[PDB]
Structure 1
Amino acid sequence: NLTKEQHEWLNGWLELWGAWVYSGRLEKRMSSVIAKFMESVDDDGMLISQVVDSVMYIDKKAFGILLSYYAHGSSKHAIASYYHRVARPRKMLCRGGGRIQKPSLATCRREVDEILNASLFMIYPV
C-alpha cells in the first residue's frame, strides 16, 4: 500500500498532469486511448504521460477512469454511479448469497476505490 505523502505528492502531480493534458497539449502518439480521450473534448506532462501510459497501458479501462477523474475532474460518486448503471450480473458470494445478479452501488464505490488505490499503487515507483 502507498503512504499518504505519496498520495498527496503523486496526487498533485496527476492534478497538474491532467490539467496539462486536458487542455489538449498532448499528441496522438502517446496513446490511441489518450487520443480517444482527446476525441472526447509541458515536458512534465509528457514525462508523466509516458509513465502513466507505460504502467496503465495494459488495462485502458481504469486508465480511462483515471483520465475521467484527473483529466476531466469528475467526482468519484458519479463514476461509480454510471459504473453501477453499466453493470452486468456476476457471481458474488454476497451478503445475500452466491446468486447471479447486478451488484449494489456501494460495491461499485468499493471497486472504484480499490482500482484507484491499485492504480496509484502501480503508478508510484515509476
Structure 2
Amino acid sequence: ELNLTKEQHEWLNGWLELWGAWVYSGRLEKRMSSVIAKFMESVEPGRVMTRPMCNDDDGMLISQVVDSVMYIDKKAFGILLSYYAHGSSKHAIASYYHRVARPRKMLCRGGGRIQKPSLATCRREVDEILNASLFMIYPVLDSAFKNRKRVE
C-alpha cells in the first residue's frame, strides 16, 4: 500500500545497485552480516564484475543499514540479495518462487481454494516485497548518510 516517491525510489535503487555490485565481489566483511555471508558462500571465487560498485566506505555503511533493517525478514533479505547482489531479474526470482511454492488459500478469483499461486501472483508478490524493503530501508539509509555528513 505504501511506496516511495519516484525520486526516493530511484535514489535508493541507484545506491542499492552499487551496493549489490560491491557485495557480490566479496568485499563485505563476513562479520558485518551473517545473512549476507551465508548468501555469499554459494558464489564462485572468480567472478566477472562488469557492474559499477561503490567505494568500500559507502558499501560498509549501506550494508550496516540493510542488515539492521532486513535481518528480521530473511525471505525478503534473500530476495533483495538475489536482485541487487546476484543480479537476477524480478521475473527469474518470481519463477523460482513459483516453482517452489507451497499450496496456499488463493482468494477471490481462486475461490478461497488451496492451490499453488500462479506465476502472475508470484511476480506481484516479488514486486511487493522489493518495494516494501526499499520503503523501509530508505529512511534509515538517509539518516545514516546525514549523520555521517554531520559528525565527520
Q: Same fold (TM over 0.5)?
A: yes
Report the Cα offset of residue 64 of structure 1.
Answer: 1.0
TM-aligned CA deviation for residue 92 of structure 1: 2.2
Q: CA deviation digits over 1:68-103, x for unaligned, max 9?
A: 000011111010001000001111223030111111
1:16: Cα distance to partner? 0.8
Structure 2 unaligned segments of length 5 or more: list them.
Answer: 43-55, 140-152
SS at match of 1:119: helix
- Alpha-carbon separation, structure 1, partners of 2:98 and 2:33: 27
TM-score by structure 1 length?
A: 0.95
May I ask how many residue pairs the two structures share in their alignment? Answer: 124
2:50 aligned residue: none
Secondary structure in 2 matching 1:103: coil
Equivalent of residue 97 in structure 1, options 101, 106, 111: 111
Structure 1 stretches lacking a partner, 5+ long: none
The change in CA–CA distance for 1:34 and 1:101 in structure 2 (over 3 A counts) is same
Q: Distance in 2 between matches of 1:3 and 1:84?
A: 29
| Partners of 1:113 and 1:15 in 2: CA distance | 16
2:22 paired residue number: 20
Deviation of 1:106 after TM superposition, in Å, equals: 0.3
Rounded Cα–Cα distance in structure 1 between residues aligned with 2:110 and 2:16: 38
Relative to structure 1, the CA distance from residue 94 to residue 103 in structure 2 (aligned partners, 3 Å threshold; closer, same or farther) is farther
Please report the TM-score for the alignment, with normalisation by the length of structure 2. 0.79
Q: Which residue matches 1:58?
A: 72
For 2:67 and 2:110, how far apart are their aligned partners in 1? Answer: 39
* Aligned CA distance change for structure 1 residues 22 and 104 (closer, same or farther; 3 Å): same
In 2, Cα distance between equivalents of 1:15 and 1:96? 36
1:30 to 13, 29, 32: 32
- Helix, strand or coil for the counterpart of 1:48? helix
Identity within the alignment, %? 100
CA deviation map 1:13-62 (0-9, x unaligned)? 0011011111100111111111111101x010110100000001111111
Q: What SS class does the counterpart of residue 73 from structure 2 fall into? A: coil
Deviation above 4 Å: which 4+ runs of structure 1?
Answer: none
